[PDB]
Design a protein around this ligand. Structure first.
Ligand code: CHL
Ligand code: CHL
Ligand code: CLA
Ligand code: CLA
Ligand code: CLA
Ligand code: CLA
Ligand code: CLA
Ligand SMILES: CC1=C[C@H](O)CC(C)(C)[C@H]1/C=C/C(C)=C/C=C/C(C)=C/C=C/C=C(C)/C=C/C=C(C)/C=C/C1=C(C)C[C@H](O)CC1(C)C
Ligand SMILES: CC1=C[C@H](O)CC(C)(C)[C@H]1/C=C/C(C)=C/C=C/C(C)=C/C=C/C=C(C)/C=C/C=C(C)/C=C/C1=C(C)C[C@H](O)CC1(C)C
Ligand SMILES: CC1=C[C@H](O)CC(C)(C)[C@H]1/C=C/C(C)=C/C=C/C(C)=C/C=C/C=C(C)/C=C/C=C(C)/C=C/C1=C(C)C[C@H](O)CC1(C)C
Ligand SMILES: CC1=C[C@H](O)CC(C)(C)[C@H]1/C=C/C(C)=C/C=C/C(C)=C/C=C/C=C(C)/C=C/C=C(C)/C=C/C1=C(C)C[C@H](O)CC1(C)C
Lengths: 61, 97, 232, 60, 220, 220
């Protein structure tokens, strides 16, 4: 009856986020890390340009 | 939880045999012809409807098509078989019985 | 999101298709493979029941033959399936079925690519054959002995211009993609053997063979053509 | 040896090996791989140097 | 003065075989007449794999030779055999009553070839994998002469009897393989059974031989 | 030109420096470096394959000449009941049998069984003598014995011997290629080689092999 999935956040049981598949699945973590919001080394103007292109294109529909 | 310090990446203990075996355990019985379907099968009629609805690809299936019954029943059994196969395999390898 | 740590601690935790603990061609019934099939090369399931590659250099030449046959057979499977598949949709080929597509050069308007007269529009057979043997000899000798797209490169996995998108920079991903290549290619070689055989015994296109099978699988299988090659 | 996006031609201001095809010894020549002995005076220092002086008119 | 082993064993060309033998064909293995003109067994490991292939082909060809001879004999004798000839004995599944074993409609009465093939492939894979690496009838035995349950009679507990029965086995098996190749080629050429071919050869030996079917495959 | 050593002529010409195996030393005649399949990695398998190559070469040369001669002589004016080579065997079943050059009183063979008996007995004798020696030799080379097989004495110099070896094996590879062509294009065309050349010279762009390309399509 081994192999529990849900873990405390970064192993800290007192910070209170409970890492979980929806939170820390490598596919999910990868996709969210590759989003311009989380590209912390890239210039904010260009991340803003990408985010704005996406949102302006989608909210016209 | 004294364990689980870093959310192990292999949270789903994947066995590539599990999907194949659930698919085969469901679809092969789902390829058995029975009296109620007129001698046909659930998978047979489901694929027949898939073909009949791919014959007009853009136009989706109707509400009165019977493709949805086959779809939902086939996938009920299939998802159940696949998840119970995963559960059984990972309980056999682990404890749980 | 966490940073995956390097492979000094993790040199071979992913080597599932290589090494002594590798899958074999009879599963648990294989026992132990021959002493030369040790699991360093891709697709090594320990299948040498005839001992034809007992010598290491003959084994190397057979690996070359197998991989080249595998690539040619993958191209051939896709090339026999694609024209018939698009001929079932309304693209007007001359003969979309593969074992009749060669005779399209004997048509009235010649061999039309995608059935389009303004496309290749080949009218002769031996200009095709001459051009083809010229260019194929050039590039097969290049494959053999260097050339414009690589001279000191590998014999089977040269890369460079043949890895433009760089899918073989990671050696782990390279060792996995080699197994994927050889397995897809053995599947395509088996499927091209099937193409040949179930063209000979049937005479219909492979996708039409599949249509016939899924029309009535209990009736339309290969046993329906079992009595066709009876003596007289 | 590189990554995908450097092959695809990104990252302007990486240009010192891009002058190599238009200046220097191993540049593009007028008959390409079939022009071996370029005139010694066409050293590859001037723009448009493809090694074409068949008539030797620019020897001085 | 027969040996079937050692340097002065019986060989494939008889008296003209002293310079016809490779150095690796030591008189160690059964049936070693010194016939490796093609040099296909120069490597001892390829030689071992080829010996296994030879012996398994031999046993399968012996079983198949007996299986092609028996039904026609029983057919000529008096038995009902919907299709007695061996190279159409497989097409009995597509008849009205299916494949009856000895003509009895209530012995086997097989109607589906796909299920027959399924059970055959399952059982055959199981037994051939057990032949490769062992199983319920011998975890660690010889790949060719396991014994210890495949000898319920116990014929080969003496090494000399073992060796001579080995030679007898491989030679009856080479005979059966030759005869099975003959079955194949002369069924394709003649279209009749082996027993009927012998009957026709005994009817008229100088007329009805293979040369009467010699101009059959000419393109023209 | 060398025909030997490291810089010998090779089967891909200028494209051939990196493909040649390490075991294909320029030692044996016809060594162009063509072992892409690696079938001769073992020197002993290589020796057996060289013997097979040379014997196939000589037999294919004799057979090429034997298929070309009777048709030439057939249009040259000489009667030939069946001049074409792939039915020259069916002359035994004609009314007058197989008459050699059309003369009824040269051979006049009526029985194919006795012809084959003759042939087998002395072919076996000759091939056994080829294997291990006999009345013409007993310890000579298995491939270039000489002695009684050089009544003219062409190859007493090693350099003449080597160049005639290369000439032999290359005319023989040419004849083997041409004999494979004879086979395949007799099956495809159904006519003799000389008549195939006549038809190719009558219309080279229309009467070629591609005119018989859709001949073996299943169409079912
Ligand atoms: C100069 C022109 C040149 C051309 C047109 C080709 C074309 C080809 N090469 Mg090739 N080669 C050429 C030079 C060379 N090749 C090779 C080494 C190989 C190998 C080892 C293989 C090929 C294969 C191929 C074929 C598949 C294309 C491919 O790999 O897509 C990949 C890239 C897509 C973008 C194709 C016929 C493959 C083949 O024939 O299998 C079907 C194959 O295995 N080539 C070398 C030595 C480094 C060359 C040197 O100049
Ligand atoms: C000196 C006498 C002597 C001779 C000549 C032979 C000859 C032979 N023995 Mg041998 N033996 C001899 C003594 C002895 N043998 C043996 C024990 C054995 C055994 C156990 C075996 C042999 C075998 C052989 C054959 C191996 C070579 C071969 O495969 O032929 C290749 C040549 C041919 C097949 C030529 C065929 C002749 C004929 C003209 C063919 C007709 C041509 C067709 C019309 C063309 C085809 C048409 C196409 C287009 C469809 C060969 C015929 C082997 C065998 O049986 O293989 C067949 C074998 O297994 N011998 C013993 C006991 C110690 C002997 C004692 O003296
Ligand atoms: C990529 C595949 C694909 C594409 C291009 C479309 C495209 C379309 N569908 Mg289909 N559909 C799909 C998959 C797809 N659907 C699947 C998987 C299901 C289940 C449906 C069920 C479905 C229904 C039930 C209906 C459509 C309808 C439509 C049209 C408007 C939406 C449009 C042509 C509608 C239509 O035009 O009819 C409609 O009524 N679709
Ligand atoms: C081993 C590989 C292989 C081989 C030998 C063939 C051989 C053939 N193919 Mg196939 N094919 C293959 C792989 C292969 N194919 C694959 C992998 C695909 C999927 C992309 C296709 C898709 C395909 C289609 C869709 C068609 C063919 C066609 C043909 C025939 C004409 C060839 C031609 O016009 O090329 C010369 C043409 C080119 C090199 C490119 C087009 C030229 C453009 C327009 C101009 C470029 C400048 C010929 C029998 C044609 C045919 O007659 O079908 C029966 C046809 O319409 N092939
Ligand atoms: C993976 C490759 C592959 C695939 C997908 C197919 C698929 C198909 N083949 Mg082809 N075939 C193949 C390889 C393949 N074949 C090879 C390698 C050969 C040469 C031995 C043939 C020879 C062949 C013939 C002669 C005929 C077919 C036919 C068919 C169709 C009906 C199935 C049948 O009769 O089975 C016959 C299968 C074989 C003879 C051997 C292939 C074995 C498979 C690939 C492995 C086993 C998987 C299978 C699901 C399990 C079967 C065991 C079962 C009894 C329990 C079907 C579309 C028939 C057709 O066109 O019907 C309309 C037909 O007449 N095939
Ligand atoms: C020992 C095994 C064996 C036996 C007992 C027979 C017996 C027979 N065969 Mg079969 N056959 C065999 C092996 C055998 N064959 C093999 C290995 C082949 C493949 C080459 C064939 C191919 C074959 C064909 C194609 C045909 C026969 C036919 C026949 C029958 C007529 C004889 C004949 O034409 O000879 C032909 C024999 C051979 C082609 C090769 C066999 C070699 C023998 C065993 C060695 C020589 C023994 C001989 C007595 C001594 C030399 C005789 C001399 C004239 C040369 C006869 C019932 C014919 C038939 O059906 O008639 C009714 C026929 O059409 N056979
Ligand atoms: C050097 C030996 C040789 C010679 C002189 C010939 C000569 C001939 N053959 Mg034969 N043939 C040969 C070898 C040879 N062949 C081999 C090895 C094969 C087996 C692949 C065949 C299979 C064959 C068939 C199936 C047919 C012929 C036919 C013919 C005739 C028409 C030419 C043709 O269709 O080419 C076909 C040639 C080949 C298939 C392969 C030979 C390869 C050659 C020697 C190399 C290429 C040389 C060439 C001039 C340069 C390239 C040309 C370019 C367009 C690619 C002609 C008399 C046809 C006939 O009877 O017409 C009257 C016919 O139906 N041949
Ligand atoms: C492993 C092992 C082990 C042990 O030891 C022993 C043994 C058993 C011997 C082994 C086995 C082996 C095998 C099985 C093999 C197989 C092979 C094959 C099948 C191949 C194919 C192969 C195949 C191939 C190449 C293919 C190819 C293809 C191609 C080119 C194509 C082309 C084309 C097309 C597109 C179509 C069109 O319209 C036309 C054409 C022109 C036709
Ligand atoms: C490099 C080399 C090398 C070797 O060594 C030697 C050699 C060979 C010698 C060399 C070469 C050279 C060359 C090729 C040259 C060329 C030139 C040219 C072409 C020019 C033009 C040139 C050209 C030009 C100027 C042009 C111009 C134009 C113009 C003005 C125009 C005007 C006009 C117009 C607008 C229009 C109007 O309405 C009128 C007019 C009035 C008409
Ligand atoms: C030694 C040597 C030497 C040098 O060095 C090289 C060389 C020349 C290569 C070599 C040789 C080789 C050879 C000759 C081989 C042969 C083989 C064979 C014949 C096999 C058979 C083999 C055979 C076999 C398995 C057989 C089998 C059989 C069987 C299963 C049967 C079955 C059946 C029957 C009962 C009948 C019914 O109705 C059905 C079926 C189902 C049909
Ligand atoms: C090198 C290599 C390399 C890599 O590594 C691998 C591989 C690819 C495998 C290899 C290759 C190989 C090959 C190609 C082979 C071929 C062969 C041949 C063609 C033979 C012929 C062969 C041929 C031959 C013997 C021929 C012979 C002939 C004869 C006897 C003749 C006879 C006759 C005549 C006069 C005619 C009359 O009416 C009758 C008769 C009786 C019919």
């Amino acid at each position: 009856k081994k192999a529990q999935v849900i873990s405390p956040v970064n192993g800290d049981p007192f910070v209170g986020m409970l890492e979980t598949p929806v939170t820390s699945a490598p596919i999910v973590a990868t996709y969210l890390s590759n989003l311009p919001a989380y590209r912390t080394g890239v210039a904010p103007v260009l991340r803003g340009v990408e985010i704005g292109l996406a949102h302006g294109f989608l909210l016209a529909g | 939880e004294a364990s689980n310090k870093s959310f192990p990446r292999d949270w789903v203990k994947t066995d590539p045999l599990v999907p194949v075996l659930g698919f085969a355990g469901w679809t092969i019985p789902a390829n058995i012809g029975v009296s109620a379907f007129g001698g046909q099968s659930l998978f047979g009629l489901f694929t027949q409807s898939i073909g009949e609805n791919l014959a007009h690809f853009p136009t989706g299936p109707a509400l009165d098509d019977k493709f949805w019954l086959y779809l939902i029943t086939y996938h009920l059994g299939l998802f159940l078989t696949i998840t119970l196969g995963q559960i059984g395999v990972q309980g056999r390898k682990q404890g749980y019985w | 999101r966490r940073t995956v740590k390097p492979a000094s601690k993790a040199s071979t935790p992913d080597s599932f298709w290589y090494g002594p603990e590798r899958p074999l061609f009879l599963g648990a019934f294989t026992g132990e493979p021959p002493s030369y099939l040790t699991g360093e090369f891709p697709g090594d399931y320990g299948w040498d029941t005839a001992g034809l590659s007992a010598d290491p250099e003959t084994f190397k030449r057979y690996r070359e033959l197998e991989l080249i046959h595998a690539r040619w057979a993958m191209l051939g499977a896709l090339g026999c399936i694609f024209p018939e598949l698009l001929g079932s949709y309304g693209v007007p080929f001359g003969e979309a079925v593969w074992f009749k597509a060669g005779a399209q050069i004997f048509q009235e308007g010649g061999l039309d690519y995608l059935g389009n007269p303004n496309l290749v529009h080949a009218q002769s057979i031996l200009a095709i054959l001459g051009t083809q043997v010229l260019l194929m000899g050039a590039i097969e000798g290049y494959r053999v002995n260097g050339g414009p797209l690589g001279e000191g490169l590998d014999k089977l996995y040269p890369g460079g211009s043949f890895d433009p998108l760089g899918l073989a920079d990671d050696p782990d991903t390279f060792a996995e993609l080699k197994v994927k290549e050889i397995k897809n290619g053995r599947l395509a070689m088996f499927s091209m053997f099937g193409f040949f055989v179930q063209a000979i015994v049937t005479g219909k296109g492979p996708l039409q063979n599949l249509s016939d099978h899924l029309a009535n699988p209990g009736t339309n299988n290969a046993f329906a053509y079992a009595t066709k090659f009876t003596p007289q | 040896k590189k990554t995908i996006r450097e092959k695809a031609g990104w990252w302007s201001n990486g240009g010192n090996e891009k002058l190599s095809a238009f200046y220097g010894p191993d540049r593009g020549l007028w008959l390409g791989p079939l022009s071996g002995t370029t005139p010694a005076y066409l050293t590859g220092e001037f723009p448009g140097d493809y090694g074409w002086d068949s008539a030797g008119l620019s020897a001085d």
